[model samples]
Target chain A: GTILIDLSPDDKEFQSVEEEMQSTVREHRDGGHAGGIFNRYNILKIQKVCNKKLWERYTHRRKEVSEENHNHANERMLFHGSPFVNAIIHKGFDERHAYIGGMFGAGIYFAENSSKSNQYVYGIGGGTGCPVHKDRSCYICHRQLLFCRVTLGKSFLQFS
Target chain B: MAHSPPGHHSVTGRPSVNGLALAEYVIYRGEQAYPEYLITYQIMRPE
Candidate 1:
């Protein structure tokens, strides 16, 4: 493949989110929890075809699509390797190993579950094997995958 | 004797990957509570 142009981290949108995440990883590395930082959201390729604006436009057009496809709007879950998060993961957070990571298998019913509903879950460690039963992943959800699990580990690790 | 640099992460349960790629598989139950401005993002990545 021919090398063309490489985008600076700043050139890309969502750069702040990306930097914040990397800093978190550094802190985690220095003494922070080894598995607290990660980005695991994936969107469909068709959804990928749509720019964020197209997404908003098409989202509004939900009324035009079939009832089955209507929910696809809400199903606009980000894809693992999409501009939404993929490249950043490759750059910043790929360095650490987390406790839990991968997609869980799918459903029971056939028609009821519906083909449109998302059927997979995967990410770096957060809630998969927590010793305690509190909602750590929920915290990740709150703060955009920057939540720390309270555990007996380093004093204050940072990813320098 | 002094303890060697620990093996796996004491809290996360993952080994000392020293900054490689780490991942986990999970199934999300839609019933969970989510705060405003945040939506639970679920994804499946390659190995």
Candidate 2:
């Protein structure tokens, strides 16, 4: 738990959140992700994580991202999945790789759906044998997900 | 009460736009996001 704070597991909030997260997972059928989901997953643990400086910066930027004379800081609780969980927990999100494509411009990407972020989680599918993105309890398939708070300012949506 | 802080402050809603599927919310700045929770999960067999 480098940058995470343990949460009480035997609480209503924990139970509720875990159940909700479990519901978001998609089931696999016919040898593939079926029903628009990847596959069923169990919530092993949930830890609260944050960055003081990053949060202060995000809080300050919120007011600016709003509309003129009105605070419309379209913020949402989103999900992010990555193999570099350790990096993100320490330094937060990065838009350094935005020069890649035309999907959502040059920025840090998050998904409203947990299943979407799940695609980026660490797995075993490289070559004959590949090392997993493991450090702690993540033995073979214990994936990582980040529930984040993002500030959406002046959304230039891809209206199509 | 302002409009766009400074740099690439324009976020986007990309719902399966190009080749990427699902609704993606993209933010340009590193400070625009805060990780609230780190969830550990695994694929479970159907029962």
Candidate 3:
């Protein structure tokens, strides 16, 4: 099982994460996808409680292909925008979770541009999006994006 | 789980001269991706 844990405001890790988001946001600030400006407010760390074995396997494969452990899983930090934030964290990603479009086949999609992923956020429509935490009123007005560590062992490149 | 050719772990899409474009990554398996950070942000819209 995986759980979302809040990071301390004063933590250096938190700062780095915010930095990562900041730099990436600036990098693609021009690829407009509707969301005008992103003001990242909170960040959380994912703890895979009983999900250790699988995590180990992923790490092992990453090491295998990275050559001399110099690579961080060839992993790229990507964005996954969704309205089902709770479900994604608690229930996990599956084929039938919700709507995934045909623009990139039926597989799970991640974006280099946060705005590209932002198209999937849930908080803007009727009966669609809710607060990150139903109890957090301060965030009653918010959208969420997941910074994922995707193990790209060997990628199949395509052009469109 | 069977879309990509054998031995490929993930799939990527690139756009032409719209090379002035965004890239999307697709992974077939769930175990291959982990949600590391959850970013809660608000979009500042000028209205």
Candidate 4:
């Protein structure tokens, strides 16, 4: 013979547990957060538009973060994900020339995964370490993440 | 776990960087060489 005693909070309901579990799991896969802060985009596609306002917020904060980390942010790329060499241009210390030099690659990085396929491709869009700039980082063309130049002889590869 | 008596442990230092560390890690990610490729790795730094 067996007996059971429930010792949970009064708010705990046992009847609809399976339904709740399924819903939670579905939310986890579909939503960026179970805590209601982020919503996941489950589609696979490229982002075409740029949100200048949102970019402003992220870059400003990232700069502050870079300075706080004492230029260690560049050294800490892998701690984030897929340390793309192009994204390194955005961490400049100069205010006047900051955006001009870093607008494209940095912007693409900021917007790419935030929108579609790349979003799900990587674990989380923003990781612990963002990009870091040395001295010679600059934007190439209109493509934000796609740098205008690959440099004297640098090669960039994307992995599956 | 197995350990031999001290002093009897092979005096020949085996510091090959194991080169296999990163390769093993990559393999663990479940990738097969496309069109036949080889992987070689060396541990450059250790924290």
Q: Choose the strongest candidate by TM-score.
A: 2
Q: What's the lDDT for candidate 4?
A: 0.20
Deviation in angstroms for A16 in model 4?
A: 47
Task: Please list all clashing residue pairs in model 2, or write none if there are none.
Answer: none
Model 4 is docked with a DockQ of: 0.01
Q: Please tell me which model should have the higher TM-score, number 2 or number 4.
A: 2
> Predicted candidate 3: interface RMSD?
4.4
Q: Alpha carbon lDDT of residue A45, candidate 2?
A: 88
Output the worst ten-in-a-row residue range by lDDT, candidate 4 chain A.
A146-155
lDDT of 4 by residue, A1-160 (tens): 1112232223233223212211221122334321122222121112222334434543454454346545422211100012331222332111221112221222112111212212211223323211332111111111112111100011122221
Candidate 4 C-alpha error for residue A18, in Å = 38
**lDDT (tens digit, per residue) of candidate 2 on B1-47:** 12233543555565443443446766667777888888887655544
> Across all candidates, what is each one's fraction of true contacts kept?
0.08, 0.74, 0.59, 0.00
Cα TM-score per model: 0.20, 0.73, 0.69, 0.18
DockQ of each: 0.05, 0.44, 0.48, 0.01
Stretches of model 4 off by over 4 angstroms after superposition: A1-45, A75-160, B1-47
Better of 1 and 4 by DockQ: 1
**How should the candidates be ordered by DockQ, best one leading?**
3, 2, 1, 4
What's the DockQ of model 1?
A: 0.05
Stretches off by above 4 angstroms in model 3 are A26-73, A97-100, A123-140, B19-22
